[PDB]
Symmetry: C3
Subunit: 265 residues, 3 copies
Amino acid sequence: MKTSVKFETIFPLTTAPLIQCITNEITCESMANALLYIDAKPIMADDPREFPQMFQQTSALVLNLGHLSQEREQSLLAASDYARQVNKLTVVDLVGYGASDIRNEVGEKLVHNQPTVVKGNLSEMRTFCQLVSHPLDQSEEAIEELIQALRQQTQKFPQTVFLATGIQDVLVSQEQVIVLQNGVPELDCFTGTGDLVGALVAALLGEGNAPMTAAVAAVSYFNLCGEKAKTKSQGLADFRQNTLNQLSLLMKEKDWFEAVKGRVL
Amino acid sequence: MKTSVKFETIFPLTTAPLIQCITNEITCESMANALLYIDAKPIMADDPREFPQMFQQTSALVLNLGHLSQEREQSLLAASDYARQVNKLTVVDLVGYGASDIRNEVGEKLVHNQPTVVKGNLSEMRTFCQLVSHPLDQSEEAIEELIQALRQQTQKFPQTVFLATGIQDVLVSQEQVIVLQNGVPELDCFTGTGDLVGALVAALLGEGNAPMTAAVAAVSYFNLCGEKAKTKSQGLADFRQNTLNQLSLLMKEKDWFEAVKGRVL
Amino acid sequence: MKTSVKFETIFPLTTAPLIQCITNEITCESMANALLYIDAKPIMADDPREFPQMFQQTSALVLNLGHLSQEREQSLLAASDYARQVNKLTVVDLVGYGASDIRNEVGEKLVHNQPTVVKGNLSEMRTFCQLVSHPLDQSEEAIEELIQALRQQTQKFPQTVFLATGIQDVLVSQEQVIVLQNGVPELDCFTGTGDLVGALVAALLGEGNAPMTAAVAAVSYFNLCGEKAKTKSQGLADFRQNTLNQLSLLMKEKDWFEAVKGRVL
Ligand SMILES: Nc1ncnc2c1ncn2[C@@H]1O[C@H](COP(=O)(O)OP(=O)(O)O)[C@@H](O)[C@H]1O
Ligand SMILES: Nc1ncnc2c1ncn2[C@@H]1O[C@H](COP(=O)(O)OP(=O)(O)O)[C@@H](O)[C@H]1O
Ligand SMILES: Nc1ncnc2c1ncn2[C@@H]1O[C@H](COP(=O)(O)OP(=O)(O)O)[C@@H](O)[C@H]1O
């Protein structure tokens, strides 16, 4: 990949950044492990009463829309407002956007507070951009449609980078459009791959990387962990285990990023 | 096993059914993974505000009694009523029935809404049938006692199949009594085997299988995954990993179901 | 280790003790598995409405301060009061103590009810003892400072054993001061090692062991599982898997405890 992104220097993380995750109860054990496996320090606290003291210590924040409830709604909106008040680097992951009105309402509010990164899968982001969601949507036509939609969003949210994940990943900012083409289809066959990509982005933001760099490196690294894992694995449980294991190993190969496939458009 | 159940055709699932799990926070990561490993699509949302929109999309529902709380109680009773109003295929898993009055009260209400399948372990189901719970209860006498008790229940709940899990599994409907004898004792030595069997039943119901077929195939497949896993495993963590891994592999053997042991009584 | 602690007899557990965990949602799947892997029987129920009936059945209780919320606060304080009223053996794990006032307030209340064991990492326990938390704090000076601080606490809480975990582990009671030196640094690189040590202590208390014995054996066994796991492992996911696996295997070596390193001071 012909790119401005300086991959050689991303890993290992050296500041042990504290990454606070206001996240769902389904994938949180694995999100905490992911973050530790790349030398970040996870904290999963979400009680608003702690925010003043916590936010002083954290380097970045994950606001994950998954498994909504009245309690998670209070935390998410409280953390989003507060993150805006104190300029906390923030990744918003629109898990389930489009599933219901209530999710959409909460999701829209998070994005309105102008986070560092907004993230989702193709379906969620298309829905966020008010496009139809019919895959047919991974076509070159549909990708170009979403790129344009996301570029219109970055005009309203000019300090926010948008990430849509899929067979190809689409990253859009006010400055760049990047399409990435790593990973394997088995990365859809265990729970939390999207959630963990969110946490990895936050981790890189917290270490000090620029937003598009954080997004491109997090997605690339995780997807290349999948690629390696597929070669070593038989069965999906085993494939999952190896992907998570690679988070701590792929790093050690001086030239892991040579496998990155993607265009800056 | 001399049986009417057409195992050859159960796997692989081809409709990618969306299975909604209103379940406990202990085993939910593994329930989501289980469902993905057999090509179902898990959704763990439980906020009643979403139900109208979600229920339009889901193919089957898991209502798991585990880790009760006031929030889980509202979700469970709301989902149970609504599932009845719209005839959603539903598996009720009476995790912990007998532990407390409050669990029993919630549990009874779920069963009163007449789900497709009611499930628990021997102890829970015996208690549900108002039998003593003293194992002594896995004896041929005690099994025959429970069969009769469950047959009396299917008279009140004639559209519901009952599953009691154990060394031997007991399945009772208004039409059939089946005893299954697969699995290994190590399937009691990691958390969630019962919970995942519930989710697998829902998955098969959602794909389109008849209830007793769904129950018999889910239990058999999971227990045969255990049998295979034991031959490859040393240590319980390792045994767990391999059981979960087999969910995605055993399927691929054209004749996995030849290992099924059980009588139609 | 020259010690009064009779390790030969700790494992295997033979009473299948029921250990109730009022714990965080991050590491609970693994805490339940841990307990099963050493032949305890986990129950993760935390609704106060069940306590009267549950407490009749449980052998020991884990009160984990992690992932605080208004719901977890009610459960924790309710369970702590009740455990005191009925003399339930209780392990209090001060996860996150020092992070916020609200955590501290809840934590102090748990310790004020005089549990069997209070546990945390060096940082948390130092903060509990009102010491500064700057590692510099693992020095021989800082260890001696904490020992003295903990001895002053056991004067207020003379029926409570205190455990501070780290490179070296510090155990203090009114009768003994013990420093342990097993484990490997990778035990900080997956989530829940501290949480699981808490559950293991409870498990040994529930089986019938004296408090300091329970604490010393739980910490030693878990840390020696890590030591073995490191020799078999490549990558952190893999190291985690093997540590958890060893919980069920190391036991089987007649002389596992010969590897224990530590002084009674
Ligand atoms: N079919 C695929 N081929 C290659 N990479 C994939 C595929 N599906 C998902 N991924 C990758 O795995 C990660 C998870 O993305 P995705 O599954 O789209 O998230 P979600 O869990 O929110 O639906 C992303 O980094 C994505 O690039
Ligand atoms: N001792 C055993 N031998 C064979 N199969 C077992 C044994 N214990 C449990 N199983 C199987 O494992 C699955 C889990 O059942 P069980 O452990 O009874 O559920 P629960 O977790 O609700 O107590 C069931 O399909 C059951 O048939
Ligand atoms: N660097 C280390 N070297 C040896 N053992 C360790 C190390 N770090 C942690 N442990 C051990 O692993 C277990 C987890 O302790 P710790 O990581 O301090 O808990 P927490 O998760 O609460 O911070 C303890 O039994 C401790 O002795």
